[PDB]
Amino acid sequence: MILVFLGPPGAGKGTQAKRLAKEKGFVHISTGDILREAVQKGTPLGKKAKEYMERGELVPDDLIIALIEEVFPKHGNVIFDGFPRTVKQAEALDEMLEKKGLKVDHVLLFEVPDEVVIERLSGRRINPETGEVYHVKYNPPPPGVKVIQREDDKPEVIKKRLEVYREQTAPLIEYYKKKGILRIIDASKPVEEVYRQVLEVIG
Numbered sequence: 722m723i724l725v726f727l728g729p730p731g732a733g734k735g736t737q738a739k740r741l742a743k744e745k746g747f748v749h750i751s752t753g754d755i756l757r758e759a760v761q762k763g764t765p766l767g768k769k770a771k772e773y774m775e776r777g778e779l780v781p782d783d784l785i786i787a788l789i790e791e792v793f794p795k796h797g798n799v800i801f802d803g804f805p806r807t808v809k810q811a812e813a814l815d816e817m818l819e820k821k822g823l824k825v826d827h828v829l830l831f832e833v834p835d836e837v838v839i840e841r842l843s844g845r846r847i848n849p850e851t852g853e854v855y856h857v858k859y860n861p862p863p864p865g866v867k868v869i870q871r872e873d874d875k876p877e878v879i880k881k882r883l884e885v886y887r888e889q890t891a892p893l894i895e896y897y898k899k900k901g902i903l904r905i906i907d908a909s910k911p912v913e914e915v916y917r918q919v920l921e922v923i924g
């Protein structure tokens with residue numbers, strides 16, 4: 722089974738994907754997480770991707786498509802989390818899959834209003850050395866665990882990221898909907914309620 726998680730930044734896609742991957746046996750492919758590892762390591766990909774990410778822009782399609790080709794699991798269930806982000810990426814993903822006799826089975830759209838988005842991203846905190854994700858209000862970090870606020874989670878960059886999402890990524894909603902595999906999630910609910918919804922659509 723192959724799932725795509727789609728939705729605005731801050732919708733809770735990474736949170737749900739980690740939980741679903743651990744509980745139900747999916748390989749979790751986070752382009753954000755893989756890109757951030759590339760950046761800390763200073764690989765050619767990391768060095769190039771870094772400037773787009775800082776400005777809240779999407780990293781060029783060709784880099785992302787090559788990345789997915791490089792990391793795509795040979796067997797097993799997969800959650801693509803934050804990929805595809807563009808129509809070209811979605812077309813490339815369908816093409817890779819077809820040559821493997823595979824296909825995207827469900828696309829889950831994590832619907833949440835912009836105001837909720839802004840609140841979630843503004844309050845997002847990360848353990849920089851483990852990657853674990855927190856929220857200063859909805860899931861606070863215990864005292865004496867060091868957390869940072871990601872630089873792209875600043876108000877100006879959030880604004881840009883949301884604009885980018887609506888322009889380039891939102892068209893994927895209609896792209897997948899016309900394949901008949903789109904399922905809607907109310908991602909504005911608390912974590913446990915969102916997770917219940919996730920299990921429902923894929924069951």
Ligand SMILES: Nc1ncnc2c1ncn2[C@@H]1O[C@H](COP(=O)(O)OP(=O)(O)O)[C@@H](O)[C@H]1O
Pocket residue numbers: 728729730731732733734735736737841842844845846854855856857859860908909910911912913915
């Ligand atoms: N259902 C939820 N309700 C409230 N806060 C959430 C929920 N899901 C995630 N969060 C918090 O919101 C922020 C964004 O979550 P994340 O999973 O990083 O979103 P995405 O991967 O879609 O960008 C994080 O700080 C996370 O702890």
Ligand SMILES: Nc1ncnc2c1ncn2[C@@H]1O[C@H](COP(=O)(O)OP(=O)(O)O)[C@@H](O)[C@H]1O
Pocket residue numbers: 729730731735752753754756773774775777778779780781785802803804805806810882
């Ligand atoms: N599939 C992708 N295509 C292009 N850029 C990507 C992709 N995935 C991640 N990125 C880059 O990584 C940044 C952060 O990614 P991600 O961890 O998915 O952030 P968030 O979960 O907050 O949206 C994006 O703003 C973008 O610059």
